[PDB]
Amino acid sequence: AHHWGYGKHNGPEHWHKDFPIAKGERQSPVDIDTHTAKYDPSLKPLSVSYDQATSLRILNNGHAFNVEFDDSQDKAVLKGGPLDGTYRLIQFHFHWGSLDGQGSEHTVDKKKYAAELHLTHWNTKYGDYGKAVQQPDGLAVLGIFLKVGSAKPGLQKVVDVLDSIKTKGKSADFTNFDPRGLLPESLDYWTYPGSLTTPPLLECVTWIVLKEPISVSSEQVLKFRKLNFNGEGEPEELMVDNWRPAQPLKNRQIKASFK
Ligand SMILES: NS(=O)(=O)c1nc2ccccc2s1
Ligand SMILES: NS(=O)(=O)c1nc2ccccc2s1
Ligand SMILES: [Zn+2]
């Protein structure tokens, strides 16, 4: 069974042994070289339609925590931008560091942010998520950088429930959470074709990475770092540095929605 992680013996540099696509042609994350990314006037504004989002549950899955949504019909969806069709929000999660100077998966001119939020959506033309991940245009992940400064008010409900899901396999009710409270002001973005950043590392993602980071407080991110990778009663391994480093860009272009 799966025994990959972010530890000293099963981290990203080992993943290729069980998931050979780890060395593939469209792996994520990547460094976004802002001077090489080209403005594409053909890109549209993103349409983030989360007014009818139905959050359900929050789960510590042993590598991050997922806030899960009802994706049994079109409620919270992502459209426009580089996308054709409609992508349904299934979950969001974060990647973060042991200290503020690392944690993001994507980097910007080699800068690492303290954390990165991933809002994961699947293309409804494929009927279910499991079918969508088998397709090159199956998923759209909206990535948002976190820097440490002022608190993010809309994040606080998330951080206050974390004490109740400290260890792997724990979950809690998490209804009526509004993910619009996690967005920055601007929806300017970069986009490129990539992959899932944890196993199975499938090359099924259109990445949309917002240029504007959100600000969270030191106290908020410190609470992320109190989570555990381990299960209940097991030796404590703090859930920190659950990020994959930048992968080779290979034959890919990163496009900018903005001049
Ligand atoms: N999936 S993996 O990163 O290749 C992996 N690494 C390790 C290390 C020790 C025991 C089992 C596994 S499975
Ligand atoms: N970190 S991510 O690319 O957004 C992502 N990776 C995976 C892997 C397995 C299942 C869901 C997701 S969502
Ligand atoms: Zn992620």
Residue 3 beta carbon below 6 angstroms from any ligand 1 atom: yes
Structural method:
X-ray
b (16+ CB within 10 A) / e for 70-93: bbeeebbbbbbbbbeebbbbbbbb
Going from the Cα of 9 to the center of ligand 1, the distance in angstroms, rounded, reads 7
* Topology classification of domain 1-259: Carbonic Anhydrase II (3.10.200)
Per the rule left: phi > 0, alpha: psi between -120 and 50, beta: everything else, 225 is: alpha
Residue 196 beta carbon below 6 angstroms from any ligand 2 atom: yes
- Other C-beta atoms lying within 10 Å of the C-beta of residue 104: 27
Listed residue (144, 149, 155, 152) closest to 108, CA to CA? 144
Going from the Cα of 198 to the center of ligand 3, the distance in angstroms, rounded, reads 7
CB-based burial label for 3 (10 Å; 0-12, 13-18, 19+): exposed
Q: 237 Cβ partners below 8 Å, 6+ apart? A: 7, 228, 229, 230
Domain spans of the chain, in order of start = 1-259
- Other C-beta atoms lying within 10 Å of the C-beta of residue 203: 19
C-beta separation of 15 from 21 below 8 A: no
C-beta separation of 133 from 201 below 8 A: no
Query: Which of 28, 141, 198 gets mutated to test ligand 2 (max ligand atoms within 8 A of its CB)?
Result: 198
Say if residue 9 carries a ligand binding annotation.
no
Residue 204 beta carbon below 6 angstroms from any ligand 2 atom: no
Distance between CA atoms of residues 214 and 216, nearest Å: 7
Structure-token match 């792997």, residue found: 168
Indicate which ligand has the atom closest to the C-alpha of 4: 1
Going from the Cα of 40 to the center of ligand 2, the distance in angstroms, rounded, reads 27
CB-based burial label for 97 (10 Å; 0-12, 13-18, 19+): buried
Residue 220 beta carbon below 6 angstroms from any ligand 2 atom: no
Say if residue 198 carries a ligand binding annotation.
yes
Residue 11 beta carbon below 6 angstroms from any ligand 1 atom: no
The amino acid present at 230, given as its one-letter code, is N
CA dihedral 235, 237, 239, 243 (to 10 degrees): -130
Structure-token match 């969508």, residue found: 132
Shortest-distance atom of ligand 1 to CA 3: 13
Give the H/E segment covering residue 46: strand 46-49
Listed residue (221, 214, 181, 197) closest to 120, CA to CA? 197
Helix (H, G, I), strand (E, B) or coil at 170: coil
This structure's resolution (Å) is 1.2
Q: Is 63 a catalytic residue?
A: yes
Say if residue 118 carries a ligand binding annotation.
yes
Residue 27 beta carbon below 6 angstroms from any ligand 2 atom: no
Shortest-distance atom of ligand 1 to CA 17: 4
Query: Which is the catalytic residue, given 2, 3, 63, 106?
Result: 63
C-beta separation of 253 from 30 below 8 A: no
Distance between CA atoms of residues 235 and 242, nearest Å: 18
